[PDB]
Design a protein around this ligand. Structure first.
Ligand SMILES: NC(=O)c1ccc[n+]([C@@H]2O[C@H](COP(=O)([O-])OP(=O)(O)OC[C@H]3O[C@@H](n4cnc5c(N)ncnc54)[C@H](O)[C@@H]3O)[C@@H](O)[C@H]2O)c1
Ligand SMILES: NC(=O)c1ccc[n+]([C@@H]2O[C@H](COP(=O)([O-])OP(=O)(O)OC[C@H]3O[C@@H](n4cnc5c(N)ncnc54)[C@H](O)[C@@H]3O)[C@@H](O)[C@H]2O)c1
Ligand SMILES: NC(=O)c1ccc[n+]([C@@H]2O[C@H](COP(=O)([O-])OP(=O)(O)OC[C@H]3O[C@@H](n4cnc5c(N)ncnc54)[C@H](O)[C@@H]3O)[C@@H](O)[C@H]2O)c1
Ligand SMILES: NC(=O)c1ccc[n+]([C@@H]2O[C@H](COP(=O)([O-])OP(=O)(O)OC[C@H]3O[C@@H](n4cnc5c(N)ncnc54)[C@H](O)[C@@H]3O)[C@@H](O)[C@H]2O)c1
Ligand SMILES: Nc1ncnc2c1ncn2[C@@H]1O[C@H](CO)[C@@H](O)[C@H]1O
Ligand SMILES: [Cl-]
Ligand SMILES: [K+]
Ligand SMILES: [K+]
Ligand SMILES: [K+]
Ligand SMILES: [K+]
Lengths: 461, 461, 461, 461
């Protein structure tokens, strides 16, 4: 009967299910929600448009939403991030999913449109779960009538939240959102420790390069740059860090990294003469982590050491100037999501040319494109937050509020600290960790409840 | 003919001056402010009561405040934290200071009273710089009339800020304060990296013990606990972490520590039966980092491995139950701020007894008691913030405001992010770090100024 | 019209060749030998039986031997270690190779036989290059007449060398050997840093498990155990180490590991009562590194935590008692080289059973089975030694010596320190490292030549 | 009425004894020998000339030698290494010791002469325990009749052993020696992990500098350089390494250090033009670890960054060219064993001069000069070996052998591996480590006894 899906190969379903059964055992916060809320069915009647990397971890999120009563229609938010066995297992469970590894851009857009439309007409969606804001943008621009009946958006990523806050400032956001990224059990777990796990993993899978003893430049030292720099330093790389934010740069210095700029004195004068050629001529590996544009620009790429690896773990495909490389230099596929870019010109190359760079995942998320992204026990935190955020906005029923009541609730908000702590506690117990209970005297002394929350909203962890 | 001081030994002044000249070269943010504001004299007319560890680093702070036009009267906020050469150098410069290493509690109170009183009468103070809140409490309880002429308090430490926020919530705070602690260039520099540097330093100076291969228990995993755990792990200790806050415990797990409780199932019901005797019987070193009371309690001390080291880098002398040890067990001074505590009874000890613990700094701040606290290049951040906070509150002139205007400004506030970034930039340049300048295109892409600030006020770093 | 090979898929040749061209740029010592000796053709007339993991790195070794004039016939020394693209590239270059990933044991023996036989008769072999000693053993037991014409064996691995030294002690060794393992640029490069790179790589590829915060037990702390312990600790695992050698255990303690035994008091009396069930009940990962038998025995496997991962990076398939698991417990293939072993019985399992272990590479070398083994820039050292050792024994022409002269040369020897240093220098230059030249006065002061060797033969590095 | 000593202050004895009693609890291998051999008095009649750093650790060694029946006469082998409380405690126990912190060179020679002479005439010495070979050299050159009656020398340090091997090769060594340094429980414990503990300790005590984020250059990567590099990297320094030995350089690369030379292309032709001014102009700290001469030369000192710290943890005072600095530049004592060296000229300096270096311990061993050297639990290994070596040579009674029998025993040898393992085992047990016992089957499989030794003499650990 069930045909409402499109995946690479449905015969991978049994493999996907074996990996989902393992992943459940690695996701105690998400499986804890599944057990706590099963009887109450808090997402009964929820119809969720989901756009996030169709991994095994996203599989456990989907099956938790469904176990709590939701229906979903799913796509990946990246052309290389799907695990074909995860997409097959979800299709085989009778869930609409449109995702495969190695989509074209045209197929990416088609997949999102297959979630929005059921049998050629808008689905009766009433919730959105987004990673990076592409689905959110398409609904606002192309399907405004659908947003009338949507109660909320839950957004995974730093870049997606930035796009929501821009819409809210400009008065174009039509439904409330939860900023899932800024839970501590997301931002200071997934963004940092996920990249610590998955960056060196992706570089090894793609290149099998020794990292020990080699020179890296990490562009950015936010949550992703911090985790990326550690991924590489812990392998024995000599890591230098670039930053525009002097507070983040101060953290890099204290963490034991040299803070450098690709530009002389940190100033881009619009010419190749402002590039620190001596510095870039020694770098074996550049990683972009910024959420910004052209932080590894054409003139940097021209100055890099021969056979340097270039990758992006931040956003989109334009942290590195891949457009410059597509226009000017010859691409030689080594294997999927690994290209040698020959700096000898556009029209062919010598197979034994020494003057190339290695680009991973065509300048798109390297951890998800060349490996499997973050591990289950880290994504547990992010995805437990996603479930709690879906429950919160679905129960508030914004779409059913009268105009005057909507105006008061139209916001981009974080989950309460108490929920962030309850997710953290399930993660700690998954490690076999034992938190201490405050005595009444101690709770009084520091001015908190024995139940928490334990820190004021200003606390930075 | 200057006599308005009390220090251990004025003949240490020349040594103090030599170390102050080195410290100036290690404190570019603080010396940057000294050079930028010297001509403007923004603290002309300021009369500052200062109570903070009389170290070489505090010496550079005092001489910066004086260089910007202030008069000060100074004491230490801890009986063991004074560096006698720093106190001597400050006295020799004609600045009133009442501080020596190894004060009694009675001498500590006398020293604070000597700052408050000049020639037997209240000094015409109009500013307060505090670390831990003891001076703040004495002014509110004993000298309320003096607070009528005081424009503000600048408070250094987590515990001091907690005490200010309690006064504000109870309506007993009489003057506005700046929370210096919660500048990122304080809390996420000093509290973390300071303890990283100075905890293993103090344990080595006191005991000369090998740390590698030994078992530690760090109680707390806030900023101080994070830095403390790293101090020990980086030396090759096997570190276990205790926490009441599940988010901080999650961080400890992800950072590669086992999270344990001294109590079975984390429940302290006050009985010896609740103590995890198997765990505590393997611990060679306990460090308290909490700012809470009785987190290393009598029953834990009884269960500790023979010859374990016990120390506190958080607050006061009651994180460890030192009162229990003073009443019940015999103390053998090894050398100043190092005592063997013989668990054989309160009266006689055998010089060759094997059943003892080693207590550092009598359960008071170990980094400052057994070594020299944080290094100059870290305290640069904290003390640049102190100077900016003093300038801000002095210029606001709260004490001269009409009643209606006072009411609107009576708060506990942090410095603006822009100043936090300007401190960080001077610290980065001290390392020879080069921040990148955003292009206008990049600044517009992430919605910030090329000049910063670079992050929203919610950002946690 | 070359057909003298058997590989998984000859159409993988182009991909293999792209990866060989990258590997050449990562192997400066091996490519330095290729360039230095090309003109001399020192292996002209050498006919080498090779048995070592048919990886990209082994590909560069093979083509170096051929570039120096050798003919070879090749097989893999492990049923899971072949990279099918590497085997294809070598076949497509017209080199006899019999190797694929996922051989049966019967296919493994048939592949070695295809190297020994050409067109149904013993090949006119005159050199052996071995890893683990299986080919060496087959020649001695089954083809002793072939050894009459063989000039020597060059042996890669600790276990293979141990087997050669046993043959020499028993007087059963028929040709001289070089112990390649005990070059410092092999043992203290490959064995240690190779495993550091490739152990966490293999565990991530097989399971995608988070390692940070979890408990590991590494059995052994020789070169492989040291590198393995670091692989895990650098990811944030809490690593405990087992050893029988108290000197290696001393090193583990000092390196910051707790040293534990699976057995109470370290005494394995073969009973379940001797197992430390509390210790094994907390372990998430066991790694064997010993080259010994039954160091993760049936009683340990029964006591392990549910869903623990078990793997071997040492030798054979019997460091872990895989025979006990094949007899007693049901194996569920997750994907190739990843099995769940259900401790509920032999005859099938509940798909949702929680009581299983995860076995990687069926208890055989996990780095080569679940990933790609050591990276090119590490194997450069091992394989430069292999080439120098082949040249040395081929030039000595043992098989052509009179009986009296044979007797004096029948030994298992290491390469001279001077060659070890010349390999190391090419590796250092590959990192862009610059070695200092001694002045004549300095060389005289420490009693060495400016050219080296720099250390006496007793030096341990 | 014991007066046969010279120390700084006999009233420090009680403090010394308290620290000796603690040190006993940290030295289980040395205290194990004291307990095992007490009844047998193996050193009854031994009269030992001892020249080694008069630390608390040396005190426990001395009192073990005395407890086993020896008489000794002691001096320090370094002018800054004595702990005055240790020297006092040894004098107060009625043991001849001539040692204080801050000897002149003339006092150093006088102290050694006070051990050799008792009441103005040669002591009836029959054993030597030396560190660095100065006492050994004096006996050979000045007191050859005394060597007739001496049974052996036990030598602590790499440099001392090199001097013994030179005497043996030249036929000038008069008595046999044990090379204590090359026990694995010395060289790969003390030399490496001792410096790891004590290098950052000494730099903090001397300067209180932040190390995190600053640039270091470690000259040498033998056991001392390895431990020194780790001391600094673990604190967050960015460490570069220099070497002449390409094998040691390879290890530095793999351990995650950049390998550089102070000289362009590593060629030290004695010209200023050969200095890499750009490299040295960024270095905040140079540490020499070589046992060689002029490895931090005048032209390097001229090129160093302003306010760089320079120190030596290797040997003598001429690894750094201190003689050049004494001749050309003005020394300003900060405090004992800390000098600012003003590069503005020889005579006066400006108190606020920015152009200086900081020299620790006047270029002599920094760990012992500015802190307390290695900790008790590490020196346990070195000193257990010293005691075994004294017992071995004393029992052999070389001086009582006839000329022809002396000739066969005149050697420089190491202790047998079995004793090295027995020292290691006591050290492991002191950490609470549990070694596994081999089964009979396992011991047979790897060809060792269940009792050990576990490795061949060629094994490098
Ligand atoms: N790949 C993944 O699995 C993964 C996980 C989490 C988030 N992300 C994405 O990674 C990006 C970074 O996320 P984050 O949470 O670290 O954001 P963040 O704001 O915490 O960090 C980004 C940092 O980049 C710095 N930066 C900006 N422009 C720069 C420039 N030109 N040069 C140097 N530094 C520059 C900023 O100062 C900032 O500190 C976002 O796009 C986010 O969505 C990816
Ligand atoms: N010694 C120094 O140089 C230095 C430096 C900075 C701050 N401090 C002091 O250190 C203390 C901690 O400061 P912080 O900035 O880390 O505060 P914080 O609030 O960041 O961290 C304190 C941590 O203690 C934990 N905690 C509380 N009670 C506990 C208990 N019973 N068991 C386990 N964990 C418990 C809390 O959950 C919290 O995470 C304060 O008193 C502060 O003033 C000292
Ligand atoms: N997978 C790879 O890529 C790779 C690389 C190098 C070598 N190897 C193999 O790894 C194995 C180990 O090699 P190595 O060079 O480390 O040898 P090694 O002799 O240096 O180390 C082996 C260690 O195992 C210890 N050991 C033995 N039995 C033990 C037991 N019952 N419990 C605990 N510890 C025990 C020994 O004391 C020794 O220290 C060998 O089989 C070698 O051929 C594998
Ligand atoms: N301070 C202490 O507590 C302590 C402890 C042990 C030994 N030592 C002394 O430290 C010194 C080193 O001992 P070790 O055991 O490390 O010796 P080692 O032989 O293992 O190491 C010395 C290293 O210096 C390198 N080297 C020599 N000249 C060099 C140069 N010009 N540039 C760069 N590298 C150069 C050599 O190649 C060698 O690797 C000796 O003098 C030893 O006696 C001191
Ligand atoms: N605390 C200490 N006491 C005695 N000797 C020491 C100490 N620290 C280091 N040493 C020795 O100093 C020697 C160098 O002179 C080293 O070989 C080491 O064994
Ligand atoms: Cl622009
Ligand atoms: K994953
Ligand atoms: K300090
Ligand atoms: K490989
Ligand atoms: K010491």
């Amino acid at each position: 009967g069930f045909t409402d899906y499109k995946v690479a190969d449905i015969t991978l379903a049994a493999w996907g299910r074996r990996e989902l059964i393992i992943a459940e055992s690695e996701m105690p916060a998400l499986m804890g929600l599944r057990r706590k809320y099963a009887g109450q069915q808090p997402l009964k009647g929820a119809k969720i448009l989901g756009c996030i990397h169709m991994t095994i971890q996203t599989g456990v999120l989907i099956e938790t939403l469904v176990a709590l009563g939701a229906e979903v229609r799913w796509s990946s938010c990246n052309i290389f991030s799907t695990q074909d066995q995860a997409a097959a297992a979800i299709a085989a469970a009778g869930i609409p999913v449109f995702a495969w590894k190695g989509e074209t851009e045209e197929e990416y857009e088609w997949c999102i449109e297959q979630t929005i439309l059921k049998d050629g007409q808008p689905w009766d969606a009433n919730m959105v779960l987004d990673d990076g804001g592409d689905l959110t943008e398409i609904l606002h621009k192309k399907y405004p009538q659908m947003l009338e009946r949507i109660h909320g958006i839950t957004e995974e990523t730093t870049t997606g939240v930035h796009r929501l806050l821009d819409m809210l400032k400009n008065g174009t956001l039509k439904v409330p959102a939860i900023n899932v990224n800024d839970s501590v059990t997301k931002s200071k777990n997934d963004n940092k420790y996920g990249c610590r796990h998955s960056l060196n993993d992706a570089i090894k899978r793609g290149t099998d390069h020794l990292l020990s003893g080699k020179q890296a430049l990490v562009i950015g030292y936010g949550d992703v740059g911090k985790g990326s720099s550690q991924s590489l330093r812990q392998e024995g790389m000599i890591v230098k860090v670039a930053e525009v934010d002097p507070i983040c740069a101060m953290q890099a210095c204290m963490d034991g990294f040299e803070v450098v700029s690709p530009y002389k004195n940190g100033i881009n004068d619009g010419t190749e003469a402002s590039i620190d050629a001596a510095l870039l001529g020694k770098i074996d590996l550049i990683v972009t982590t910024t959420g910004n544009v052209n932080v590894c620009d054409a003139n940097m790429l021209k100055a890099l050491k021969k056979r340097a690896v270039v990758c992006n773990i931040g956003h989109a495909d334009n942290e590195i100037d891949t457009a410059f490389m597509r226009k000017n230099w010859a691409w030689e596929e080594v294997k999927p999501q690994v290209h040698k870019i020959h700096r000898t010109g556009k029209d062919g190359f010598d197979a034994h040319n020494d003057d190339y760079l290695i680009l991973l995942a065509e300048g798109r998320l390297v951890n998800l494109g060349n490996a499997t992204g973050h591990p289950s026990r880290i994504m547990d935190g992010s995805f437990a937050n996603q479930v709690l955020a879906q429950i919160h906005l679905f129960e508030q029923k914004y779409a059913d509020l009268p105009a005057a009541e909507k105006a008061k609730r139209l916001s981009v908000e974080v989950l309460p600290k108490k929920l962030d702590e309850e997710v953290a506690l399930e993660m700690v117990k998954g490690f076999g960790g034992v938190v201490t209970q405050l005595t009444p005297k101690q709770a009084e002394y520091i001015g908190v409840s024995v139940e928490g929350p334990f820190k004021p909203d200003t606390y930075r962890y």
